[PDB]
Amino acid sequence: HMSYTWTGALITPCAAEESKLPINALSNSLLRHHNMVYATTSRSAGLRQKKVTFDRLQVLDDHYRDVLKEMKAKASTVKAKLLSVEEACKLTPPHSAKSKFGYGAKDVRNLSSKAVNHIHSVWKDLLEDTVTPIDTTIMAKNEVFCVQRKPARLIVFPDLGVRVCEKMALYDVVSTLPQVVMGSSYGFQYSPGQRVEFLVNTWKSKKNPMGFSYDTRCFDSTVTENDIRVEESIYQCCDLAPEARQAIKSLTERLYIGGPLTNSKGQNCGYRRCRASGVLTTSCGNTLTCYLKASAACRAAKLQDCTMLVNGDDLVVICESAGTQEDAASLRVFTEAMTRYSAPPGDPPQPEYDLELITSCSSNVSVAHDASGKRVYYLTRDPTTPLARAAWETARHTPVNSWLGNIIMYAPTLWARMILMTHFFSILLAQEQLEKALDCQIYGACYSIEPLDLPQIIERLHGLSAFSLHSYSPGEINRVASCLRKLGVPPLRVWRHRARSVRARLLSQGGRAATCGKYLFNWAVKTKLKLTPIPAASRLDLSGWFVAGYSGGDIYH
Ligand SMILES: COc1c(-c2cc3ccc(NS(C)(=O)=O)cc3c(=O)o2)cc(-c2ccc[nH]c2=O)cc1C(C)(C)C
Query: Which of residues 332, 361, 390 is at a domain's end?
Result: 361
Q: Which atom of ligand 1 is nearest to the CA of 406?
A: 25
Known binding residue 313? Answer is yes
Q: E strand or H helix at 45, and its extent?
A: helix 45-52
Do 170 and 191 lie in one domain? The reply is: no
Q: Tell me, letter by letter, the H, E, C secondary structure of 308-344.
A: EEEECCEEEEEEECCCHHHHHHHHHHHHHHHHHCCCC
* Cα–Cα separations (whole angstroms), residue 268 to 44, 137, 260: 19, 9, 7
Q: How far apart are CA 520 and CA 195, in angstroms?
A: 23
Do 84 and 229 lie in one domain? The reply is: yes
CATH number at residue 348: 3.30.70.270
Please calculate the CA angle 86-90-93 and round it to the nearest 5 degrees: 140
Helical residues (DSSP H) of 183-281, grouped into ranges: 192-205, 219-222, 225-235, 242-251
Amino acid at the residue 228: I
Q: How far apart are CA 52 and CA 310, in angstroms?
A: 22
Do 495 and 399 lie in one domain? The reply is: yes
Residue nearest to atom 28 of ligand 1 (CA): 442
Residue nearest to atom 34 of ligand 1 (CA): 192
Q: How far is the CA of 192 from the centre of ligand 1 (A)?
A: 10
Q: Where are the beta strands (DSSP E) in 28-78?
A: 37-39
Do 263 and 290 lie in one domain? The reply is: no
Residue nearest to atom 30 of ligand 1 (CA): 409
264-287 burial, b at 16+ Cβ within 10 Å, e below that, comes to: beeeebbbbbbbbbbbbbbbbbbb
Q: How far is the CA of 441 from the centre of ligand 1 (A)?
A: 9
Method: X-ray
Do 451 and 368 lie in one domain? The reply is: yes
Do 413 and 525 lie in one domain? The reply is: yes
DSSP one-letter code for 392 = H
Do 216 and 340 lie in one domain? The reply is: yes
Residues with CB under 6 A from ligand 1: 187, 192, 195, 282-283, 286, 311-314, 361, 363, 379, 405-406, 409, 441-444, 549, 551
Q: How far is the CA of 154 from the centre of ligand 1 (A)?
A: 18
Number of folded domains in the chain? 4
Resolution in A: 2.0
Do 10 and 69 lie in one domain? The reply is: no
Whether 361 and 213 have beta carbons less than 8 Å apart is answered as no
Do 72 and 45 lie in one domain? The reply is: no
Q: Strands 259-262 and 209-214, how do they pair? A: unpaired
Strand order in the sheet with 136-140: 4-6, 268-272, 259-262, 136-140, 154-157
Do 553 and 520 lie in one domain? The reply is: yes
Q: How far is the CA of 300 from the centre of ligand 1 (A)?
A: 28
Do 138 and 166 lie in one domain? The reply is: no
Best mutation site among 551, 554, 555 for ligand 1, i.e. most ligand atoms within 8 A of its Cβ? 551
Q: How far apart are CA 63 and CA 50, in angstroms?
A: 33
* Cα–Cα separations (whole angstroms), residue 372 to 83, 197, 470, 526: 48, 20, 10, 16
What phi and psi values does residue 236 have, to the nearest 5 degrees?
-70, -15
Residue-number span of the structural domain to which 27 is assigned: 1-55+133-158+258-273
Q: How far is the CA of 327 from the centre of ligand 1 (A)?
A: 28
Do 386 and 514 lie in one domain? The reply is: yes
Based on the number of CB atoms within 10 Å of its own CB, is 84 exposed (0-12), middle (13-18) or buried (19 or more)? exposed
